[PDB]
Every structure is written in structure tokens, then in C-alpha cells.
Amino acid sequence: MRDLKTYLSVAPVISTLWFAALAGLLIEINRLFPDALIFPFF
Amino acid sequence: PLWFASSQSLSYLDGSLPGDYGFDPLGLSDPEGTGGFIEPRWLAYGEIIHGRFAMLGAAGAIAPEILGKAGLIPAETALPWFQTGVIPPAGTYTYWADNYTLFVLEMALMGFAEHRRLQDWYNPGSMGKQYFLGLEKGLAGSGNPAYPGGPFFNPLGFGKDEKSLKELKLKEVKNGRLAMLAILGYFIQGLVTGVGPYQNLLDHLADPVNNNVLTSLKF
Amino acid sequence: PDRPIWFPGSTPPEWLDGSLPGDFGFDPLGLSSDPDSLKWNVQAEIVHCRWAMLGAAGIFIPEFLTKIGILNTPSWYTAGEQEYFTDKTTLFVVELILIGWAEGRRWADIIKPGSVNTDPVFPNNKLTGTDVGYPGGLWFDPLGWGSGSPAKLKELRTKEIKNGRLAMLAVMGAWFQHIYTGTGPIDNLFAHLADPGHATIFA
Amino acid sequence: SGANFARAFTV
Amino acid sequence: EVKILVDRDPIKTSFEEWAKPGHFSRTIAKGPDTTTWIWNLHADAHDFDSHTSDLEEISRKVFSAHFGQLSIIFLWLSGMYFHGARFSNYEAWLSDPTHIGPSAQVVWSIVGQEILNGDVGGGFRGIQITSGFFQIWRASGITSELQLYCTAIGGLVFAALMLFAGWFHYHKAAPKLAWFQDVESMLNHHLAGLLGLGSLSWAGHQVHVSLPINQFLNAGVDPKEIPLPHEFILNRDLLAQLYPSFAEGATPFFTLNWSKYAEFLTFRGGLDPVTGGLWLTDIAHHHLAIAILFLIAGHMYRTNWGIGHGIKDILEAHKGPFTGQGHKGLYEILTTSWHAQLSINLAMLGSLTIVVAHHMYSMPPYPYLATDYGTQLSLFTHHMWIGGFLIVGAAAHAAIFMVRDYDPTTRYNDLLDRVLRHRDAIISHLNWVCIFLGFHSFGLYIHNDTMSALGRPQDMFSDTAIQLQPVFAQWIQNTHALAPGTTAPGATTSTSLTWGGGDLVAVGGKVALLPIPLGTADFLVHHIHAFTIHVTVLILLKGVLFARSSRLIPDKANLGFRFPCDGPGRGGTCQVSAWDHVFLGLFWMYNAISVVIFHFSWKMQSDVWGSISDQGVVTHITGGNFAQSSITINGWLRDFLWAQASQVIQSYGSSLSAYGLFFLGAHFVWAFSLMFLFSGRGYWQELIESIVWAHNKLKVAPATQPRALSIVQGRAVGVTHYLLGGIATTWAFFLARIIAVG
Ligand code: CLA
Ligand code: CLA
Ligand code: CLA
Ligand SMILES: CC(/C=C/C=C(C)/C=C/[C@@]12O[C@]1(C)C[C@@H](O)CC2(C)C)=C\C=C\C=C(C)\C=C\C=C(C)\C=C\[C@@]12O[C@]1(C)C[C@@H](O)CC2(C)C
Ligand SMILES: CC(=C/C=C\C=C(C)\C=C\C=C(C)\C=C\[C@@]12O[C@]1(C)C[C@@H](O)CC2(C)C)/C=C/C=C(C)/C=C/[C@@]12O[C@]1(C)C[C@@H](O)CC2(C)C
Ligand code: SF4
């Protein structure tokens, strides 16, 4: 289990999980708010 | 007593096995480079198990037809071995439960038997240690995986003498080989003529010249 | 050492000595090789046992009673949909706060074994339990049955663990039966008992 | 053929 | 003799090795000091020959890698089948194939990309596919979706089985070395078992399942009313009504009066008028004949018994006029080194792929395939690119063998030594023929352009001023046209319609095939093809031959297979390794394949494809201007590149916008590649120095010191980007044009 965690801590795997999570967040934000050219909150 | 024995095969076949006739043209049981599921002991165990199961199946596939023809069983019960529901496209019969429920029940019971058998094969005397409602005492085994013996599997005390035991082992292996050949014949016949083997025997006895392999293939 | 195991004739893993309550040497995947992993898994299993046990009781008692004419409680699956005196989100938030306080206390106990055994408001109260996952004290052990000989304690813990495991399996079975078939679990049980041959999952 | 296209737009 | 030899548990499956990278090589395993380490860890990942020296470990690793590759292929096939089953309009296309475009991909509706869901037809929206899978499924007899689902599930199960087999054979039971080196049994099983039994079983399927279902489909019956395939097996009445011969059963075959089977095993040849494809009876007959031939030919080599032939005996005992002793030590060379086998197999596979592409465009083997222009273009281009790449790789592996696996002491070969001893004559003659061919072939075009620009159209090499006709090709075409009457009494018609003479075949108002004329332009283009092929051969052969040693560097073997140079001395010695020769030959292979595919596309669009009217006239796509406009470079630039790019660039705002986006992206990548191809390492290192100073000023310098890419890595990156950009440009252009106008 120690070496499994160590391998999952390697650079490519951590990078791909991080980028997948970020892409999912961006995709969900763009789906919830369809399109926007300016910041209208303030 | 050698049948098609080769120079390579005769080296490792020392005759210390029931029904050892030195026949091995392809050299599968060669004793160097053995691994996985290719080992002489495992092959012998498989041959014995196949012989036993084939004898059981050969008896059971031919009993109902004869019993029905003799009038000792109701007609609606006696069926050929492929109309019993094994092959639904060929035919089907009704039982007290659905086919798949019986399949699950048989799978559970046979798993309970066969996993214990496999664990016995792995570790010889392990299987008679843990509590199993008191039956484990009779399941210790004799140390030879092929013939566990014991009160449960040898209650009649047969084969006490070593010579009689060897003769009985030879009888068992020969009968197993015969039953395996019979089952293969059942399969091929049911594939070709589409009729139960007992009716094939009756037709052959009625008129051997007009009823054989050739007439069905015609020419 | 020579305790019964899940697979007779096999060798149990080296990290399951057998001192833990309700042990059978069942860990083929090696998910608890590290010690801290073992502690976390033990705590998670205990909490899951308790929660699933309460859930199984609260699912199978009212439904069976409603099979009789004693009560009229609706089905467990539609309980969330039925209306109440407040919107569901407010109840969720209040429950979140109330359970979050207790979960924070339990987590602080897990990280530091003996740091949350004192009542902060009135310091006269205390919790006498001396094991993680077994708080003890008057609030959680009023009858005092928790304290006793190590053998009896081990036996009681084994009974609790086995009941919890059975409860988890029963709850998951009830959920899957409801989604797959679409009827109350007691109805399925009666239908199966009437016709054990054909009234199966295959149907 | 309509159901296959609709499978993408279920949400 | 021949036997199974295995080793039990050579390696133990453990996660300990996964934790630390680079365990195969010690210098990698030490630890990272600079960034170069990272770039090395991927460069030697599959260099099994350099990790160790024992043949057993290399063979076992090769076996396991093969199993993994097979699992990946099976997963890909299962995915394709599941996509066909779930998100597709196959059932709509089955009833009306001519007016419905195949499509098996549906795009989500996230950002505004929903415009990619074009209206292919049949009440469906999705991306049109050009893989030709629908024709394969129709020819196989599939008429529903449950069958496709079952096939996908079976493919997934097979992938899982292959993965388990790979793990089991590497980590539990590993075959020994003597098992691998038994080539007689390997050849016997690969010929009799893999190629004979497989084709016989496929012939059985075609005879039993595909033929009746396809007959019912061609008869005009609705797909939902056709009986299921197993009903044909169970019921003899249906087969008897469809084919009376089946009423006799298997009796004729055992009686040697096979003419009774002439109903569904024919020899007509040609194209089927209804679907514009080969007769399925002919295909089944060909498969049966191939099965018989392969089963006969798979019993040639002696294995574990008295009968057979010995490969070593055949090689040693062959005495000829030109060879002599010749082939003596070739058996050890070909049974000891993996690289020689890899080179030969790669060359054979590349040639086979090219031949496959040619034969497949010549004679369409699937129903409703000829009239689909996009599918034909895509298949031809893809297969030819694959063949070119494989043929190129063969030379690189031959060079590897010559560098690191050749010693004249233990294993000596006479023919190889004789070839090596006179390399200068070979290279000189190849150089002369390349120069002469290129000079003539390109000078003809330059002369045509110059005489055109000066207003002298009567001094050209054209169809009207000075003629150069390919007389031999025309004679061959005439002989093939006249063959069916006299040379092939059995065949009712020609093998293919491409040969001159005969009749036009068209399906659903679209031309399927007609004779292809040959003139001056074909002459010039074929000579250009020969020139490019010769130059590529010269580059690769020089790289292979001069790998061990040269006049400039007498000890090039010690430096190795991959070394950038030897130094600034001797006038400069950059790019002398065989790796650089492969890197140089890649460009010329790309050039040749591009020219060939351009020729094929223009000729097919000009003189074969088109539309036919009720009256009978044929209007081609481009008006048949290839014969007069393709003899000048201006004609190729104006009438082909400029005219046919209108559909690619004017696709914005429509359902083909992705093609224009890829058209621009490929240009960007192609321009990007020159950055690596033109510059050098020292400038980049000196710039990284200042950048690193700027970093260190703010206490953010890493422990792994940045380093510029090595020379070989820079060249590899450049060539990779160049090839990718060019291929993507051609792909986008071809697909957009042929989908829009076809
Ligand atoms: C590459 C080949 C090529 C060829 C074959 C031609 C051919 C032709 N050109 Mg073009 N041309 C070319 C490229 C070429 N051109 C290029 C690159 C340009 C620059 C743009 C031009 C520009 C051009 C112009 C401006 C003109 C021509 C014209 C002509 C004609 C004049 C030829 C001539 O008189 O000299 C032939 C001279 C010889 C001495 C022949 C030598 C070769 C002999 C036969 C070798 C045979 C060797 C032997 C058999 C080998 C074995 C020996 C053994 C027996 C011992 C001729 C038809 C002229 C014209 O208008 O014609 C209509 C003209 O005015 N050309
Ligand atoms: C049939 C299969 C085949 C096989 C098994 C091999 C086997 C071998 N090759 Mg050979 N080779 C082949 C075909 C094959 N080759 C072909 C067709 C060519 C012509 C290009 C070559 C040319 C070649 C060269 C030039 C070299 C080898 C070498 C090697 C060895 C090292 C492999 C390596 O380290 O890569 C590990 C993996 C990588 C570096 C992957 C690189 C990434 C590729 C290039 C990108 C492709 C881009 C992708 C498709 C685009 C998608 C874009 C998206 C990702 C954004 C290995 C034994 C090397 C050697 O030193 O041998 C000892 C070497 O120098 N090969
Ligand atoms: C059109 C192609 C091209 C491009 C794009 C570049 C780009 C650049 N040049 Mg190069 N160059 C080229 C051709 C090209 N060159 C040629 C032909 C030569 C002659 C040999 C040179 C010689 C040269 C010199 C001498 C120098 C540069 C330098 C630079 C940089 C200048 C700063 C800047 O523009 O950053 C803008 C950055 C970008 C446009 C880069 C692209 C960003 C990509 C697209 C983003 C990644 C996104 C996406 C997720 C990719 C994923 C990949 C996939 C596998 C997953 C920049 C990297 C100068 C330098 O290094 O400055 C620091 C410098 O010293 N160049
Ligand atoms: C176990 C077996 C069959 C078992 C059947 C059973 C239980 C049937 C049960 C049922 O019927 C009932 C009761 C009732 C039905 O309602 C249902 C079913 C279920 C149908 C057959 C084995 C059948 C096994 C067979 C036929 C094996 C043949 C092997 C051969 C010929 C090997 C030859 C060689 O291996 C040698 C010996 C040496 C080498 O050197 C060379 C070669 C040539 C390789
Ligand atoms: C906590 C829990 C678990 C269930 C169910 C939990 C299940 C099924 C867990 C299964 C775990 C398995 C199988 C693990 C296996 C292994 O990990 C081992 C052990 C060892 C490894 O070596 C090998 C593998 C295989 C990895 C369930 C809790 C349920 C609750 C509170 C239900 C509450 C409610 O009903 C009420 C009261 C009233 C209703 O109106 C509302 C709800 C909300 C519906
Ligand atoms: S360092 Fe560069 S320029 Fe100098 S010889 Fe080597 S490759 Fe050529």
C-alpha cells in the first residue's frame, strides 16, 4: 500500500488527475453559466 | 503390453501407474519443462476425475430411455438426453423450479464440494482441521489426492490388499476410458442423426445393413 | 493463531494476528498493510456497522408493521418526497450542524486518544472509556455493561461487529430489491415464501 | 435513430 | 526434440519496483541530477537488447509486449463495435444506403460545438464517418443491434483474456530459450493453423450465413423481415428453396462430383451490377481454395518426426550458378538476432499494405463501397501511409543489426561479406541512376512550363505537340481485355473493369467503374514515382551499408548507432550515424507518398468518378482536365491546389468547420517544426542560463537543473512535428473536399 501511494504520487499521474479535475470544474462552470463576455456581478 | 510406445515416452513411464501402457505420441507428460497445468501428477488426477464423471454421465444418459421403453417409468418422464432441457433449442421440459434457479443451486453445492477438494489437493491434511459440524474427521484423506479413502468414501472396506487394490485401480481407469469414448459417441451421434442412442441401437439391431453411418450419409 | 478463517486450509495474512474483535483473516487485496490504515479501517467499519444497523432496524420495523394493520407509515423509498412542516434544506442544515459537532469531537478523539474526555461547559462530568471507538461514560454506557473482563468484552464486540455486517448486507439488499423490482421488501419475502420455486430474481 | 441521438442530450 | 520447456515464477509481481523509476538501467536508476534524465527514461524504455544480454529475458519481454498489444487492439475493436451499436444510424442506412451518409459519433452540447452534429440523413444528426465499417457489417450479414452488442461484449472479454495471458506468461510460466528457437514448429502452426483454419472457417461462415442474408437483402426484402441466420442452419427447406443444391446435403462432396455445388461456388468474376462489388460466391470460392492451399503448404518442415524438410539443409545444400556456397551461416544469424527478423517482417508488411491498397481501390470487395468516394479515398491514403512508414522502419532495424549484432568471427556469411566488399560500386551506380531519372523527369515539366510562358504551345511534351505514350501499359491493357475470351475460358468477364474496353458500371446514378485511359501525363507521373522511390532507396541503402565503417571514419562501430557527430575536424562530420540517415530518408518517403496520393486523387476525380444521367452521358467532377493541365507545375498549383481548396476554407459556420480548424492547425505545427529543424543547442543553453539567473534571483530555482535538449532529440522533435503537420494538412484537405463534393 505504501508503494501504491508512492506510485500514485508520481508526477504524470498527479498531473493528469489535477488537470482532469480542473477541466471538469471549468466544464461545469461553463455549463451552468452558458456564455459571458463581461463581469456583471458588480 | 505397449501400445504405440515411443523412445521418448518409454523413458519416464516407469509403469508405476494404473493402466500405464506407454502410449504418448505427443509427449505431453514429459518430466522436464513442466509448469502451469502441464504436470504428470495433475494429468493423472484429471484423467481419473474425467473417467469417474464420464462413467456417471454415460450411465445416466442411457438409463431413462431403457426405463421408458421397458414400461417401468411414466412415458412423459422418459426423454432423450438432449430433450431434458439442457439444450433449449433442441427441446425443453418443465420441473418444480426454473432452470436457472436449479443452475444456481447446483453451482452452490458443487462449489462447496469442489473448493474443499481443491484445498485438499493444495494442502494434504489441512482440510480435516477446522470445525465443519463434526464431519472433518472423516475428510482427512489418505495422503494420495486421487484416492482419499476414509470412512465416507470407502465405507465398504474394499481394496485392503495391495494387489487387489492395483487390480481395482486398473479396472477403474479402463472403465473410465471406455465411458469417455461412449460419451463422445453420444455427442457425435446426437449431432448427426438427432435421435437418442438407444433408438440408434434398436434400429441397428433391426437391420444392420440398412442402418449404419453410411446410409445416413447416403451415397 | 489457530482461529477459524474465511477460507479453510489457506494461510491468513501476516498483519491480521487475530487480536482484533471479529477477525477471520479476510483481506485478499491487502488494503490494511500499514498500521494507520488498520486503525482507520477499524474505526470506519465500526461506525458503518452502527449506522447500517440503525438503518436496517428503522427500515424493516415500520414496513413489517405496515404489512399488518397496526400502523400506516409510508414506504421508506418515498419518505424523502412526502411533505413535512419545513423545507428539506433547513432540516438538512440543522442536522448538518448537530451531527458535525459530534463528528468533530469523535475525529479529535481519533487523532488524539485522550483529549476530549472532559465536559467543556461543566467540568465535573467525564467519560470513563479508555478505547477509541468505545466512548464509555454515563451518556453512552449507562448500564455499565461495557466494562468487564477482556474475554467477555471481545465476545461482545464480535457479536456487535457480526450484527453490523449482516445489517449492511440487509440494507444494500433492500435498496437493490426496491430499485430492481419496485415493491416493498416484505412483499417480496412473502411472494418468495409462497412460491420458492419460481419467485426468484430470475422470475 | 432518434433515440440514439437523444442518448447524448438526456441531461 | 520438440517439447515444451518453461520456468516457474521467474519474477514476482510486486509494487516495490513501481515506486522508483528507471529500474531497467543502472545509470537511470541512480537518480535525477538534470532534466536530461527524464528525457532518457522514455528513450530506452523498450530497448530490451541493452537492458541485459541474455536472450531468454529478451524473448520473454517480447512475448509479454505482444500480448499487451493484442489486448489493446481487441479493446479498440470492441469500442468501435459498441459505438456502431449504440450511437449510430445503421438500421436507417440498411434500408436506403445510397441516400444516407454513415455516422457513428455524436457530439455533446457543451459550448456551441453542437453545430458539429451535421444532418447526414435518415432522421439522425452526427459526424459522418469514413472508416467503411458499415459496408463491412452489411457484407458480414449483420442486420440488427443486438448482434453488435454481443460482438462488443465478446471483444471486451477477449481483451481481458489477452491481458491475463500476458501476465501469466511473464510472471508465472515463462517459456525457455529452446522453445523460442524452434522455428519449424512455429512455421508449421502459423501456416497450417493460423492461415488455413481461419480462412476455412470464414469460408464456412460466408457460405452458411452471409450468402443467404445478402441474397434476401439484394432481393429487395425489408431488413426487419429477413429470417435470423440460425433459422437457415436449423431449417433445410429455406436453404433448399434458396439453393436446390443444399437439398443433396454433403453427399456430393464426398462423391467427388463437385459440379452440383456450382450454384453458390462460381467463377464469373467482374462486378455485381446491383451493388458494384465482387460476387460473394467468388469470394467464398477463393477463401475455400486458399484454405486448401495453405493447409497443404503448412506441412513442409520436419518437426519431431521422420518426414518433412530441414531449413538448415535447404539453405546449405542450395548450389547455384551465381550464388555458389552462399547461404551457409544465415540460419544462425536469423535465429539469433531479433533485429534481422524485425527488418524482414517490416519490409514484407509494408509491401503487403501497399499492394492491399492498390488491389482494394482496383476491385471493390464490399457492397455499396465503390459509390462511396470518401471511404475509397480515406482507405487508399491511410493504407499507403502505413506501408511507407513500415518500409522506412525496416531499414533502420537492418542498420541496428549491422551495427550491434554483426561479428565475422563466430558467425560468418559469404554473401554478406561479398556485398560489403564492393559497396562503392553499388552506391555510385545508384547515385548515377537517381541523378539521370530526376534530371529527365523534372526537366520535362520545367521545359513544358518555359515553352508555355513564352507562347510556344507547339513545342511541349504534350498530347498534341510531342507525344510520349506508354505503349507497354497500353499493350498490357489490351491483352487483359482480350484475355477472358481466350486466355481465361473459365472466367466469364474481366478480372477488373480498370482494363481498357468493356462497359461502364454505375449504381444509383453514380459511376462505379470504367476503363482508365493512359496518356503522356501518366508516363510523366510514373517516371516521377520511380525517381522518388530510387532516391529514398539510395538514402536508406547508403545508411545501412556504411554503418559499420567508412573512409572518413574508420571506427564508426565503436561510437554506436546513435551518436550526433564526431567533431568539427575533418572539415565537419555532422550526421554520419545511420540514425541520421533514417531521419533524412523520412522526408523523402513523405515526399513520394504525397505525390502518389495527389496523383491518385486528381486522376480519380477527373476521369473515373462523376455522375450519370438517364440519357446516358457521364459528367465527371472536374471535367476531365487532368490530361491537358497536369503537364505543367502551374497546372498542378492552379487547377488542383487552388481550385480544390475552396471547400476547405469556405466551411466556416457549417458542419465541416472542424476540417478548416485542423487545416489551420496543421499549418501552424508545420511552421513550428522549422524552429527545431534549423537552429542549434548552444544558443538555447546560453539563453536558459540567463533565465535560470533570473529565477535564482527570487529563490525559486529547482533542484533538477534545466538543460537544453540534446542534438538527436532536437532532430527527432523536428522531424516528428514536420511529418505530423504535413499529414494533418493533407488529411483535412482531402476529407473536406471529398465529403463536400462527393
Ligand atoms: C531534362 C531534359 C530536357 C530535355 C530532354 C529537353 C528537350 C528539349 N528542349 Mg528543353 N529545357 C529543359 C529541359 C529539357 N529539355 C530545361 C531544364 C530548360 C530550362 C527552362 C529548357 C528550356 C528549353 C528552351 C529555352 C528550348 C528548349 C528546347 C528543347 C529541344 C532542344 C534540344 C536540343 O537541341 O539539344 C539536344 C542536344 C544534344 C547534344 C543531345 C545530347 C544527348 C544525347 C542524345 C545522348 C545520348 C547518349 C548515348 C545514347 C548514351 C550511351 C553511349 C553509347 C552508345 C556508347 C528539346 C526537344 C528548344 C526548342 O524550342 O525545341 C523545340 C528551346 O529553344 N528547352
Ligand atoms: C513493428 C513495430 C516496431 C517495433 C516493435 C520497433 C522496435 C524498436 N524500435 Mg523501431 N521503428 C519502426 C517499427 C518498430 N520498431 C518504424 C515503423 C520506424 C520508422 C519510424 C522505426 C524506427 C526506429 C528508430 C528511429 C529507432 C527505433 C528503435 C526501436 C527500439 C526502441 C523503442 C523506443 O525506445 O521507443 C520508446 C517510445 C517512444 C520514444 C515513443 C515516441 C513517441 C512517438 C514517436 C510519437 C508518435 C506521435 C503520435 C502518433 C501523435 C499523437 C499526438 C498526441 C500525443 C498529442 C525498439 C526495439 C530505437 C533504437 O534505438 O533501437 C534500439 C530508435 O532509435 N525504431
Ligand atoms: C510559426 C512557428 C514558430 C513559432 C510559433 C515560434 C515560437 C517562438 N519562437 Mg521560434 N523560430 C522559428 C519558428 C517559430 N518560432 C523559426 C523558423 C526560427 C528560425 C530558426 C526560429 C528561431 C527562434 C529564435 C532564435 C528565438 C525564437 C524564440 C521563440 C519564442 C518567442 C516568444 C514568443 O513568441 O512566445 C509566444 C509563445 C507561443 C506562441 C508558443 C506556443 C504555445 C503553445 C501553443 C501552448 C501549449 C498549448 C497546448 C495545450 C499544447 C499541448 C500539446 C499537446 C501535446 C498536449 C516562441 C517560443 C525566441 C525565444 O526563445 O524567446 C524566449 C528566440 O530566442 N525562435
Ligand atoms: C467427462 C465427459 C462427459 C461427461 C458427461 C456428463 C457428466 C453428462 C451428464 C448428462 O448426461 C446426463 C447424465 C444427463 C443429461 O440430461 C445431462 C448431461 C449433463 C448431458 C467426457 C469426456 C470425454 C473425453 C474424451 C473424449 C477425451 C479424449 C481424449 C483423447 C482421444 C486423447 C488422446 C491423446 O491424449 C492421448 C491419450 C495421448 C497423447 O499422446 C495423444 C492424444 C491423441 C492427444
Ligand atoms: C452504513 C450503511 C452501509 C450499507 C451497506 C454497506 C455495504 C454493502 C458494504 C460493503 C462492503 C464490502 C463488500 C467490502 C468488501 C471488501 O473490503 C472487504 C471487507 C475486504 C477487502 O479485502 C475485500 C473487499 C471486497 C474490498 C448503510 C446505512 C443506511 C442508513 C443509515 C439508512 C437510513 C434510512 O433507512 C432509514 C433508517 C430510513 C429511511 O426512510 C431513510 C434512509 C436514509 C434510507
Ligand atoms: S557539434 Fe554540432 S556543428 Fe559541431 S560537428 Fe557536432 S553536429 Fe556538427
Q: What letter would DSSP give residue E308? A: S
| Chain D contact for E125 (CB, 8 A cutoff) | yes
Q: What angle do CA C178, C183, C189 make, to 5 degrees?
A: 90
Alpha helices in E191-266 (DSSP H): 198-205, 211-218, 229-234, 236-242, 251-255
Q: Which of E387, E346, E336 is nearest to E592 (CA)?
A: E387
User: Ligand 3 — pocket residues by CB below 6 A?
Assistant: E 671-672, 674-675, 678-679, 687
- Alpha carbon distance E210, E229 (integer Å): 8
Which amino acid appears at position B96 of this protein? W
Q: Which residues have a Cβ under 8 Å from the Cβ of E75 and sit 6 or more positions away? A: E155, E156, E159
- Asked whether B148 and B155 are in contact (CB, 8 A), the reply is no
Q: What DSSP letter does each residue of E430-447 carry, written as one string? A: HHHHHHHHHHHHHHHHHH
Spatial separation of the C-alpha atoms in residues E693 and E446, rounded to whole Å: 55
What would the grid cell of residue E104 be?
A: 457513428
CA distance linking residue D1 with residue E123, whole number of Å = 6
Closest to E233 measured CA to CA, from E155, E151, E141, E144? E141
Classified as helix, coil or strand, E588 is helix
Determine the Cα–Cα distance for residues E654 and E580; give it in Å rounded to an integer: 44
Given a contact cutoff of 8 angstroms between Cβ atoms, the answer to whether E124 and E103 are in contact is yes
Cβ(E450) – ligand 1 distance below 6 Å: yes
Q: Would the CB atoms of B218 and E251 count as touching at under 8 Å?
A: yes
Q: Are E343 and E397 in contact (CB under 8 A)?
A: yes
Residues of E in contact with A2 (CB under 8 A): 19
Residues 6+ away with beta carbon under 8 Å from C171:
C52, C55, C56, C59
E536-541: which pairs have CB atoms within 8 A and are 24 or more residues apart? E536/E392, E536/E585, E536/E588, E536/E589, E536/E592, E537/E430, E538/E427, E538/E430, E538/E431, E538/E434, E539/E581, E539/E584, E539/E585, E539/E588, E540/E392, E540/E395, E540/E581, E540/E582, E540/E585, E541/E395, E541/E426, E541/E427, E541/E430
Give the whole-angstrom CA distance, residue E561 versus residue E556.
Answer: 9
Q: Does B82 contact ligand 4 (Cβ within 6 A)?
A: no
Contact C66, C72 (CB under 8 A): yes
Tell me, what amino acid is at E201? S
Which one, of B60, B54, B103, B96, lies nearest residue B79 by Cα? B60
A7 touches chain E (CB under 8 A): yes
Ligand 2 contact via E723 beta carbon (within 6 Å): no
Candidates E722, E713, E637, E630; CA nearest to E673 is E722
The grid coordinates of residue E378 equal: 480515406
> Ligand 2 center to residue E393 CA distance, Å?
9
CA distance E713 to E708: 10
Amino acid at B63: A
What is the sign of the dihedral through the CA atoms of E668, E673, E679 and E685? Answer: positive
Using an 8 Å CB-CB cutoff, list chain A residues near C28: none
Resolution for this experimental structure (Å): 3.3
- Contact: chain A with chain B (3+ CB pairs below 8 Å): no
Count of Cβ atoms closer than 10 Å to residue A16 Cβ:
10
- The grid coordinates listed for E732 are 483535412
Q: The cell 490494511 sits on which residue?
A: C32
Name the burial class of residue B65, with classes exposed (0-12), middle (13-18) and buried (19+) by CB atoms within 10 angstroms of its CB.
buried
Ligand 4 binding pocket mutation candidate from B9, B53, B188 (most atoms within 8 A of CB): B53
Sign of the torsion angle spanned by Cα atoms E221, E222, E223, E226: negative
Residues with Cβ within 8 Å of E282's Cβ and at least 6 positions away in sequence, in order, are: E266, E267, E268, E269
Quote the strand ranges of C71-139, DSSP E: none
**Residue having the nearest C-alpha atom to atom 4 of ligand 2:** E342
Whole-number Å distance between alpha carbons of E532 and E433: 11
What letters, b where the CB count within 10 A reaches 16 and e where it falls short, cover E709-731? bebbbbbbbbbebbbebbbbbbb
Cell of E536: 529514398
Angle between helices C150-181 and C35-67 (to 10 degrees): 60
User: How many CB atoms sit inside 10 A of residue C175's CB?
Assistant: 15
Query: How many other C-beta atoms lie within 10 A of the C-beta of residue E12?
Result: 8
Q: Which residue has the cell 452558458?
A: A34
Please tell me the distance from the alpha carbon of residue B27 to that of residue A19, in angstroms, as a whole number.
Answer: 57
User: What's the burial of E630, exposed, middle or buried (CB within 10 Å: 0-12/13-18/19+)?
Assistant: buried
Rounded Cα distance, E96 and E102, in Å: 11
CB B13 within 8 A of CB B20: yes
Give the C-alpha separation, C136 to C37, whole Å: 24
Distance CA E477, CA E499 (A): 5
- Amino acid letter for position B37: F
Please give the angle made by the CA atoms of E637, E639 and E645, to the nearest 5 degrees.
80
Distance from CA of D5 to the nearest CA of E (A): 7
Q: Nearest CA to CA, how far is B37 from chain E (Å)? A: 10
For residue E66, the surrounding DSSP H or E stretch is helix E55-86
**What's the per-residue H, E or C state across chain B?**
CCCCCCCCHHHHCCCCCCCCCCCCCCCCCCCCCCECCECHHHHHHHHHHHHHHHHHHHHHHHHHHHHHHCCCCCCCCCCCCCCCCCCCCCCCCCCCCCHHHHHHHHHHHHHHHHHHHHHHHHCCCHHHCCCCCCHHHHHCCCCCCCCCCHHHHCCCCCCCCHHHHHHHHHHHHHHHHHHHHHHHHHHHHHHHCCCCHHHHHHHHHHCCCCCCHHHHHCC
Query: For residues E334-346, b (16+ Cβ closer than 10 Å) or e, as one string?
Result: eeebbbbebbeeb
Residue type, E469: Q
DSSP character at residue C32: T
Neighbouring C-alpha atoms within 13 Å toward the C-beta of B139: 21
Is residue C101 marked as binding? no
Task: Count CA atoms closer than 13 A to E392's CA, side-chain side.
Answer: 25
Could you give the maximum distance between any two Cα atoms of chain D, in Å? 18
CA distance B66 to chain E (A): 28
Q: Are E91 and E146 in contact (CB under 8 A)?
A: no
- Contact of E371 with E415, CB cutoff 8 Å: no
Q: Indicate left, alpha or beta for E455 from its phi (over 0: left) and psi (-120 to 50: alpha).
A: left
Q: Residue E420: CA atoms inside 13 Å, Cβ hemisphere, count?
A: 15
Question: For residue E463, what is the DSSP state?
Answer: S
Query: What are the distances in angstroms from CA E409 to CA C7, E54, E285, E323?
Result: 61, 20, 52, 22
In the DSSP assignment, the letter for residue E191 is: I
Chain D residues close to E92, C-beta within 8 Å: 1
Terminal alpha carbon distance of chain B: 40
User: Cβ A10–E111 below 8 Å, yes or no?
Assistant: no
From CA B189, how far away is CA B181, in angstroms rounded? 12
Write out chain B residues lying below 8 Å of E250, CB-based. 217
Residue C75, helix vs strand vs coil? coil
Chain centre to alpha carbon of residue C166: 9
DSSP E611-671: EE-SSS-EEESS-S-HHHHTTSHHHHIIIIIITTTHHHHTTTTSTTHHHHHHHHHHHHHHH
Per-residue CA distances from E92 to C163, E145, E224, E367 (Å): 57, 12, 11, 16
Residue whose CA lies nearest to ligand 5 atom number 2: C52
